[PDB]
Amino acid sequence: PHKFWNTQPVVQNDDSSSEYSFGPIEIEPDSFRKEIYKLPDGFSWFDCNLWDIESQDFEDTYQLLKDHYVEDDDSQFRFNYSKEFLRWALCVPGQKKNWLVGVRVNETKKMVGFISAIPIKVRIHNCIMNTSVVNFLCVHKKLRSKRLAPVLIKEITRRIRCEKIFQSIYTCGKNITKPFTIGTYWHRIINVKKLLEAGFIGIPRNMTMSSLIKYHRIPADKRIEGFRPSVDSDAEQICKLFENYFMKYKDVSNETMNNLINYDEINHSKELGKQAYMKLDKIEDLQDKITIHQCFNVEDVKHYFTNIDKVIVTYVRENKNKEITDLFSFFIIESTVINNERFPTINIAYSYFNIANTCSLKELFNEMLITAKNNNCDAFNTLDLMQNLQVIQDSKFIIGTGRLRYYVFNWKIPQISPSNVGIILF
């Protein structure tokens, strides 16, 4: 039984609707709480200065997440996001200073809480909007189970609404309310010895370390040339590549895609905002198409689909006309081995956005797997989003533990396959 989420404009697990529809759950442009939320006495909010990678805030935030952010089911691994990664993930085009929210102990100046939002643009069926992604919610372990998380969530909500934004996207490794999709984790083992020594996998009784190495090898043959890291000047071509990709997989007509309802222009009125409601006749109308995805302008492409060592890798394929025709990308996050002092961390690649036009998605992922190996990644992680299942099938990926639940705040999305979802959170 929820005490917080049952009061929020999200679809509840017991939602009893017999129709598939889209649109805002509520249109409440001026009725939200505007006063800052109270923290326990002795604590204070601050805008986290992640704008200087050398800042004390950045050091405190890095340390908070390193020691208290997400752990796996059995508390063997914990994420160790680098400062360079956090800068790339949070200082995005259009970011607001007050969407990076810390909690500090007044007497000691020690940071004990963080929550972030980043701005993104999303298409949801026939609508388009500026929205937010909430991520990196973290409370110091000594302060857990004291209901601080709803305080942080309400305060980031207030800060997002003060920017005239009333929706958000977020994921969680557990069920909270009703998710609009569920992602499955898939792991491609790259460095077998390192992952055995870390305890991520073990040596099966019918195998050996040498046969395990042999089985998990990234296939070497069948290389496709023409791939190269992207550079800044690619941004326009990459932006066009994504447009054609989303146009290819659209779940609405061509005319609708060129005439999306801009929710930004109507979310100020309970009457005009009603235009965003859309009844879907059949859920099969969405099969094999993309229903919700991020939208990238050229500035966004330049920031996200770049190449920063140990953070983000983006390659493009050119054709004989030197036109970009394909793209693969993955980001890199280190994880700490909690129960290990001598082998403390491991580098993990995570599939980002991938577009295959001149080769198969399998061929592209094989090139990306080799590039991940050459970037010293110990494993390659992917979700069954977009068309990734085509690659995950008939492959050597191994299923992960748990599931990734996708949520949208204050919007209705029918439950859809993760193949219909083009939203990757960091």
Ligand SMILES: CCCCCCCCCCCCCC(=O)SCCNC(=O)CCNC(=O)[C@H](O)C(C)(C)COP(=O)(O)OP(=O)(O)OC[C@H]1O[C@@H](n2cnc3c(N)ncnc32)[C@H](O)[C@@H]1OP(=O)(O)O
């Ligand atoms: C318009 C704009 C809207 C913007 C806002 C949109 C929503 C964004 C929402 C957040 C997006 C997060 C995106 C990411 O970053 S996902 C990763 C979340 N972070 C971690 O897992 C790191 C390690 N764990 C922790 O730091 C704490 O355990 C956290 C802080 C997670 C909870 O701390 P604590 O363990 O000390 O708990 P509590 O007693 O204070 O609070 C209990 C209440 O909190 C609800 N709860 C617990 N965990 C989560 C969770 N991960 N998402 C949403 N709700 C959560 C729980 O259901 C209950 O409510 P109810 O069940 O009684 O109702």
Ligand SMILES: Cc1cnc(NC(=O)c2cccc3[nH]c(-c4cc(Cl)ccc4N4CCNCC4)nc23)s1
């Ligand atoms: C040696 C190791 C290899 N992989 C490791 N993963 C962990 O320890 C881990 C712990 C807790 C939660 C996790 N979620 C994911 C993940 C996995 C895949 Cl396949 C695709 C996407 C994923 N996430 C990343 C976090 N944001 C949401 C999406 N991984 C973890 S440890």
Ligand SMILES: [Cl-]
């Ligand atoms: Cl679920």
Ligand SMILES: [Cl-]
């Ligand atoms: Cl499971």
